[PDB]
């Protein structure tokens with residue numbers, strides 16, 4: 001099973017402020033929607049509750065609480081090891097899609113990074129983890145918008 | 158000025174049937190929308206007249222005719238050569254977006270390929286050039302849909 005990771009990171013490393021992404025970069029959302037289309041996303045409970053289950057994708061959510069869902073495209077797991085063990089039974093690809101805790105737990109085990117760098121230095125308390133040294137960028141594309149962003153893909157090895 | 162290229166190619170190599178793309182793979186057009194958001198697109202007159210000027214994009218349309226457009230996001234050029242001459246003075250990135258004639262003319266000049274391979278073998282009369290030998294794939298992701306597709310980015314090197 002391949003693991004990808006997708007994130008939008010501002011210039012100071014901030015990805016979140018409380019439950020919110022502290023910016024709106026028009027157009028950036030399209031990258032996320034396009035790459036995650038009909039994919040399994042692995043997300044932490046906080047991100048999942050805040051974002052909700054968008055249509056046309058499937059969610060593996062980790063929680064230590066009794067959090068539940070009645071959406072047929074959502075699976076709730078008590079641990080990451082348990083999410084990954086079960087996902088490997090039904091898919092060959094999972095996209096880690098946040099938040100801070102989940103990115104930090106899994107970045108050493110992912111194969112491909114999708115990083116949109118957002119041209120802003122906002123206030124926030126949720127940061128993206130340091131990127132392991134064996135990752136290298138293989139593709140870059142700049143976008144001009146209300147807030148500028150740059151999309152970059154990284155491969156391990 | 159960087160040159161990219163973006164195309165959806167069916168499994169037998171067909172990219173077009175008359176003025177149309179002979180398939181509908183749900184989700185694939187999201188990739189097109191995402192990558193071309195607020196970008197300059199170089200297109201041939203027939204593809205332009207057939208697809209129209211989608212919003213949040215700029216178009217450089219080549220024609221040997223006196224074809225005109227009153228769309229504020231559309232520039233018309235008498236040749237591909239003159240389009241490139243002018244585009245390099247007003248942007249740093251252009252995405253070659255079809256159709257067949259335009260792909261044939263520019264494939265040897267572009268830096269990056271965005272290719273969506275569409276899991277279908279349709280009727281059609283328009284094909285894509287052979288991919289130049291110095292291009293290598295650097296990213297791949299598969300998508301399950303009504304028609305499956307696979308997205309691959311190629312770099313020259």
Ligand SMILES: NC(=O)c1ccc[n+]([C@@H]2O[C@H](COP(=O)([O-])OP(=O)(O)OC[C@H]3O[C@@H](n4cnc5c(N)ncnc54)[C@H](OP(=O)(O)O)[C@@H]3O)[C@@H](O)[C@H]2O)c1
Nearest residue numbers: 008016019020021044045046047063064098099100101102
């Ligand atoms: N900029 C971006 O691309 C982006 C993308 C996604 C999210 N974000 C931001 O990131 C912030 C949320 O991140 P966060 O780090 O606070 O929370 P989070 O990673 O989304 O979720 C944390 C929660 O996940 C559960 N969890 C974490 N590790 C677990 C484990 N090993 N086993 C079982 N459950 C586990 C716990 O749930 P319980 O509390 O239920 O026990 C924990 O409270 C938000 O601001 C969000 O907007 C930004």
Ligand SMILES: NC(=O)c1ccc[n+]([C@@H]2O[C@H](COP(=O)([O-])OP(=O)(O)OC[C@H]3O[C@@H](n4cnc5c(N)ncnc54)[C@H](OP(=O)(O)O)[C@@H]3O)[C@@H](O)[C@H]2O)c1
Nearest residue numbers: 164165173177178201202203204220221236255256257258
């Ligand atoms: N599958 C995909 O991802 C994709 C994407 C785009 C298009 N397509 C397909 O491609 C097909 C249409 O392509 P096509 O090859 O027939 O036509 P085209 O490339 O879209 O347009 C050709 C026209 O461009 C102008 N032109 C070409 N070279 C020129 C030059 N050097 N200088 C000035 N003008 C030049 C001429 O316009 P004038 O006639 O006005 O002189 C020519 O008729 C359609 O079936 C469409 O669906 C597929």
Ligand SMILES: CCc1nc(N)nc(N)c1C#CCc1cc(-c2ccncc2)ccc1OC
Nearest residue numbers: 006007008019020021028029032050051097116
């Ligand atoms: C679109 C940014 C984004 N970009 C990239 N490159 N990766 C990501 N992981 C996210 C993200 C995220 C998480 C996220 C997404 C949305 C969202 C709202 C409306 N349409 C789509 C998504 C809302 C809340 C949210 O977390 C509070």
Ligand SMILES: CCc1nc(N)nc(N)c1C#CCc1cc(-c2ccncc2)ccc1OC
Nearest residue numbers: 163164165186189200204205208209211254273
């Ligand atoms: C989704 C196609 C597409 N997919 C891929 N992978 N590559 C491409 N090059 C194109 C293409 C094209 C041609 C094209 C398509 C649209 C379009 C219209 C309505 N919804 C989405 C797109 C607009 C203008 C345009 O050229 C003037």
Ligand SMILES: [Ca+2]
Nearest residue numbers: 100101102104
């Ligand atoms: Ca943490």
Ligand SMILES: [Ca+2]
Nearest residue numbers: 104128129130
């Ligand atoms: Ca770290």
Ligand SMILES: [Ca+2]
Nearest residue numbers: 236237238239
């Ligand atoms: Ca020419």
